[PDB]
Design a protein around this ligand. Structure first.
Ligand SMILES: C[S@@+](CC[C@H](N)C(=O)[O-])C[C@H]1O[C@@H](n2cnc3c(N)ncnc32)[C@H](O)[C@@H]1O
Ligand SMILES: C[S@@+](CC[C@H](N)C(=O)[O-])C[C@H]1O[C@@H](n2cnc3c(N)ncnc32)[C@H](O)[C@@H]1O
Ligand SMILES: [K+]
Ligand SMILES: [K+]
Ligand SMILES: [Mg+2]
Ligand SMILES: [Mg+2]
Ligand SMILES: [Mg+2]
Ligand SMILES: [Mg+2]
Lengths: 380, 380
C-alpha cells in the first residue's frame, strides 16, 4: 500500500520568507516595549524595496528602518552583486492604527482572559507519531536542507552560496491502520542562488555530499533516489530581484507541508489576539499532546471563531482511525484539559514574549523550543 | 459518528480579494493582446493605495491605471464615505521583466507542448459526491452567502450594504464508509460593511431573512442553528481602510474551505506556466472526473513538479476508503487518461483565454463554466 507524498521548504533569503521574517521582527520590536501591542504588519518585497503596511496600535517606539535593515543584514543580503543590499534598499512604511470598529469589539474594556477572537476563522492542528518531533518526515527534511545550506553559507565553507533557496522532498510511505510509516526518499529537489564563479557540476556535487548526505538519514536514501539539484542550471538572479515576496505566502511551508489541513490564515506579523496564529499554535499543542499521551498515532484538530467571541464556535477531532477512543471521547478529553479562549491561550503559551522572528523561517512547528511544542500531560 | 466542519468565504470588497481580482484583471488584460504573456503580478492594498508589483514579460500594452480603477469601480468602492474610491486612490506600479535565468530554463526555445514547470511545487485536487458540483457543502454555502449580499447591494434592495464581507458556515456531517453526508447547519457567521444610517437589529433581520434563508436549503436549518450576524456590532470602517490586503492570502477560500489539502501556491496573477495554478486546476479536473466516473465518492490527488521539468515528479491518489479499486489501479486510470505536463494542460483547459478575473472571487472550483469543472470521460 505504498504511496508518495511531497513537501517543500524555502530558505531565509526566499522573498516570501524575507517578508515573514521582517513582519515578525516588527512584531518582536513592539512586544519588547509594549507586551499588549496590537500588530497586523504585512511586508512586501521586490527589487530594491521593502514596504511595511498594515495596522499597529502600540505604545512602543520602533525604528522601522533599523529593524528592517538589521533583518535583511542577518539574512545575508549585503551587496548589489547578490541582488539586494540592506545598506541601500528602499524602506517604505505605510502603517496606521487598528480600526476602532475592530478594537471596541475585540478587546476594549475587557479583562485579558475575556478578550474576544480578533477575527472569524478556522484553524487546524496536526500531529503524527512518524518522527520524534511528531511531524511529517517530508516537511522536516525539507526544512533541514535549507538550514544546512544557510549554515554552510554563513560559515564560509561554501562561499558561492547565496541566501535564496528552495527544497522539495518526496517520500514513499506505507500505511499501518491509519498511521503512516516513511520507507524511502523517492525524489529531492534543491535550487539555491549562487555567484558567478562556481561551476554547475561542483554545485551539484556539493549539494549531494555536503547538504543532502549531512541531513538525510542514510537508511532512507538508495541508488534509485532521484536528484534534481540546481535543475534550472543557472540561479544567479535571486532574492527580491528575481521574484516578488509577500508576508503569508508560505503558509503550508510554515505548518505541515500539505499534511493535516490548513484554515487559510497567515502567522507572521500578527499578535496573539489574531486567532489565525494563536489558535493554530494551540491546536498544534492539543494535537501533539493527544499523540504523546498515547491516545492516537495521527490526529487532526479543527477550531473556529467569530470576531469578538472568546469561546470557539466549533471543535473537531479526526484520528484517521488510529485511536481506540472515539472522537467524541477525545473531544471530552480536550474540553477537560484545555481552555481555547485566546485570553487563556496567551497565558498557557506565553504569547507576549518577543520570540516570533525565530518562527518565521524553518517552520513554526516541530521545534521543541516553542511552548506549543511542549505537550500538556492529559487527565483522562 | 457526527462531526462538525467549518469553512469561510469573503466577498468582492474584502481587501485580500480585491488584490486577487486586480491581479487577475491585469493577467486578463495581457492575455487579450498576447496569449503567451508571462505574468506574476502581486497586488497590495491599504488605505488609499493599490501597488502592483511582480514580473511581466509581454507584448501587450496595458493601461494599468485603467485596469485597476475599473476593477475597483466594479467592486463598488466609489466614494470616500465607503473608505475607498477608484476615482481618487493612489495606483503605484513596480513591474519588471521576468528573470532571464528563469526564462531560459522554463520556456525559451521550447515548443509549447514541452514547456517546463515554471517553478517547483506541490498541488492538490479534491472532489466529493456530497453536492452536485462535487464540492464540500461548507465552502459552497459560504460563497453563496457573499454572492447573495453582493446581488442585494448592486440591485439597491439593501442600499446600506457595502462591498467588504465575510461569511463562515459550520455543518454537522455523518460519515458513510469514508464518504461524508451533510446533516444540518450548526452555526453561521456573517459580517458585512454597512453605512451609518441602518440600525443593528434591522441589519441582523435582513441577513437572516433576505440572505441566509434565500441561499441555504431550509432542510438544513432548524431552531437550534446558531447565528452570529454582525457579531462585532459595528462595521462601518472596512475595505482597505480597515485591513491591508494582499494577493494570495485567501488560498483556502479559493479552493476547498479546508477540506482536501493545499500545496501552498496562490492562483491569482499567474499565467498557465505557473503550475501553482494550472496543475491545481488540472488536479481538480482529475479528481472530479474520478468521482463523476463512479470510481470513488471522495478523492484527493497530489502532483508535484521541479522548475524546468515538464513531467510531474510524483502523482498520488487518496480515496479515503471510498473506492473499490486500489489507489494504484486509479493511478493507472489517471496515467491512461491525462497528460499532466503544463504544455498539455494549457490545451486541454484553454488556459490562455482571459477568463481569470471571474475566478478571483467566489471560489475557483465548483462553477461549471470553467473547463476544469467539465469532467473528462474516463476509459478504464
Ligand atoms: C521561479 S520564481 C516564481 C516565478 C516568477 N515570479 C516568474 O516571474 O516566473 C519563485 C522562486 O524560485 C526561485 N528561483 C528564482 N530564480 C530561480 C532560478 N533561476 N532557478 C531556480 N530557482 C529560482 C526563487 O526562490 C524564487 O523566489
Ligand atoms: C478583523 S480584520 C483583521 C485584523 C486587522 N488587520 C487588525 O488590525 O486587527 C479582517 C477582516 O475582517 C473584516 N472586518 C473589518 N472590520 C470589521 C468589523 N468592524 N467588524 C467585523 N468585521 C470586520 C474585514 O473583512 C477585514 O478584512
Ligand atoms: K511571487
Ligand atoms: K491583513
Ligand atoms: Mg511566492
Ligand atoms: Mg485571516
Ligand atoms: Mg488577510
Ligand atoms: Mg509558489
Amino acid at each position: 500500500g505504498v504511496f508518495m507524498f511531497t513537501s517543500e521548504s524555502v530558505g531565509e533569503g526566499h522573498p516570501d520568507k524575507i517578508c515573514d521574517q521582517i513582519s515578525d521582527a516588527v512584531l518582536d520590536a513592539h512586544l519588547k516595549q509594549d507586551p499588549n501591542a496590537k500588530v497586523a504588519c504585512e511586508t512586501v518585497c521586490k527589487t530594491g524595496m521593502v514596504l511595511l503596511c498594515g495596522e499597529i496600535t502600540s505604545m512602543a517606539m520602533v525604528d522601522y528602518q533599523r529593524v528592517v535593515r538589521d533583518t535583511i543584514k542577518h539574512i545575508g543580503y549585503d551587496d548589489s552583486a547578490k541582488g539586494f543590499d540592506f545598506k541601500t534598499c528602499n524602506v517604505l512604511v505605510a502603517l496606521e492604527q487598528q480600526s476602532p470598529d475592530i478594537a471596541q469589539c475585540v478587546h476594549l474594556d475587557r479583562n485579558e482572559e475575556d478578550v474576544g477572537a480578533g477575527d472569524q476563522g478556522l484553524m487546524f492542528g496536526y500531529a503524527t507519531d512518524e518522527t520524534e518531533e511528531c511531524m511529517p518526515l517530508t516537511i522536516i527534511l525539507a526544512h533541514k536542507l535549507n538550514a544546512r545550506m544557510a549554515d554552510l553559507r554563513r560559515s564560509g565553507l561554501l562561499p558561492w552560496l547565496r541566501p535564496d533557496s528552495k527544497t522539495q522532498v518526496t517520500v514513499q510511505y506505507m500505511q499501518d491502520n491509519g498511521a503512516v510509516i516513511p520507507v524511502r526518499i523517492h525524489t529531492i529537489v534543491i535550487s539555491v542562488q549562487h555567484n558567478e564563479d562556481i561551476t554547475l557540476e561542483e554545485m551539484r556535487r556539493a549539494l549531494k555530499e555536503q547538504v543532502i548526505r549531512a541531513v538525510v538519514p542514510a537508511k532512507y536514501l538508495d541508488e534509485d533516489t532521484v536528484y534534481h539539484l540546481q535543475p534550472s542550471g543557472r540561479f544567479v538572479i535571486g532574492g527580491p530581484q528575481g521574484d516578488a515576496g509577500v508576508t503569508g505566502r508560505k503558509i503550508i511551508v510554515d505548518t505541515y507541508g500539505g499534511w493535516g489541513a490548513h484554515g487559510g490564515g497567515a502567522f507572521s506579523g500578527k499578535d496573539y489576539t489574531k486567532v489565525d496564529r494563536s489558535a493554530a499554535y494551540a491546536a498544534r499543542w492539543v494535537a501533539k499532546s493527544l499523540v504523546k499521551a498515547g491516545l492516537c498515532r495521527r490526529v487532526l484538530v479543527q477550531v473556529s471563531y467569530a470576531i469578538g467571541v472568546a469561546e470557539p464556535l466549533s471543535i473537531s477531532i479526526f484520528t484517521y482511525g488510529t485511536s481506540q477512543k472515539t472522537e467524541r471521547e477525545l473531544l471530552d478529553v480536550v474540553h477537560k484539559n484545555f481552555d481555547l479562549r485566546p485570553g487563556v491561550i496567551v497565558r498557557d503559551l506565553d504569547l507576549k514574549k518577543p520570540i516570533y522572528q525565530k518562527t518565521a523561517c524553518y517552520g513554526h512547528f516541530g521545534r521543541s523550543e516553542f511552548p506549543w511544542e511542549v505537550p500538556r500531560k492529559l487527565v483522562f
